[PDB]
Amino acid sequence: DVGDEYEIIETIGNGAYGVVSSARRRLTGQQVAIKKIPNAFDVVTNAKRTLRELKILKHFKHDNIIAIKDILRPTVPYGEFKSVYVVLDLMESDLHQIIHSSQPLTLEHVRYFLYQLLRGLKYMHSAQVIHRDLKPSNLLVNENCELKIGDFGMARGLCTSPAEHQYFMTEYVATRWYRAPELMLSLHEYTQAIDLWSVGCIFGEMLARRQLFPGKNYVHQLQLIMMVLGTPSPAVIQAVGAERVRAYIQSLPPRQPVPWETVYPGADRQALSLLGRMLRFEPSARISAAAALRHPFLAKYHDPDDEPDCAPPFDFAFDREALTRERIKEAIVAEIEDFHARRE
Ligand SMILES: Cc1cc(Nc2nc(N)nn2C(=O)NC(C)C)ccc1Cl
């Protein structure tokens, strides 16, 4: 059941949320995507994640971030409510599908896709939200070339609970190929700078239409980053949590960084200038999303008056709480109610 307000067309694929249904609002004919989260309250970690995503997507109001158009209200008694139905914007493709296809992808495509990504990020980052899992598949693109950041399951603030495993096991946070050196190496510096490494990776991937660091495992991933970036500094090496990784990096002959001009021959000069400001071992050495929008490479689209920040910041306190499956269900049901009490 989809509240009798919608008409289901077909089951489509989604880069950010796996499998969704293309549908239409029966009154207006407006095309939408309907995500079903089956048995949503069965497992603690899944239930916590649904709550996190709902709170994050409700807090944001930005064209480059995926929006909740509607959330279906429980039709059955409370005890029987097991599946959540979320109405999202209908996004036909994603950046993974576009990069890795026979479709055009000129420097102008790259410039415009990076612009939309950084626009959405400047806003997200000012709310003290770190996506922590940016990748081409998570950057939804529609028929009108609108890029929208989706999939906030890995998202956290500047402060995290020690009660969760990823607080210590940072190398398991997100996707290997786009995972920031501070997460790979447990450098105890976890800011929005994490996302700018991932942006750099996506930027490189758009320029060559191939993954920049497609490591086969943990060590191989580090070897790939070090083949381009060179050996990390002694300060980065001293900050490495694990003794085996630290010893492994120290066991290697020194390597100087490879110029980006050698990595991407004949690629646009301003594109490579910006890329080098993102791909740095040191998180604090990286350009912020706001300063990147000021870079000459994005001058074409850059309008400071059309690139908002997000006020107030987003608070992750709800997520640090040890909540039972029932308490999470209660908090999700209260999000549905709030979403509806804020419209009417
Ligand atoms: C759009 C939206 C999506 C979710 N998705 C969600 N929650 C949980 N637990 N899994 N999940 C997935 O999308 N999983 C797939 C990747 C297989 C939750 C809330 C909202 Cl608003």
Numbering used by the authors: 50 to 393
Q: Can you provide the manuscript's text about this entry?
A:
The ERK5 protein, which is encoded by the MAPK7 gene, comprises an N-terminal kinase domain and a large C-terminal domain containing transcriptional transactivating functionality and nuclear localization and export sequences (NLS/NES). ERK5 is the effector kinase of a canonical kinase module comprising MEK (MAPK/ERK kinase) 5, MEKK (MEK kinase) 2/3 and ERK5 itself.
The allosteric binding site is a cryptic site that is absent from other structures of ERK5 and is located between the P-loop and the αC helix. The so-called gatekeeper residue Leu137 lies within 3.5 Å of the methyl substituent on the phenyl ring of compound 5. A comparison of the IC50 curves at different ATP concentrations for the allosteric inhibitor 5 and the reference compound 2 shows that with increasing ATP concentration the IC50 values for both compounds 2 and 5 consistently increase. Kinase-selectivity screening showed compound 5 to be more selective than the type I inhibitors 2 and 3, with significant activity against only five kinases out of the 225 tested. Consistent with the differences in amino-acid composition of the allosteric binding pocket, compound 5 showed less than 10% inhibition when tested against a panel of MAP kinases including ERK1, ERK2 and p38.
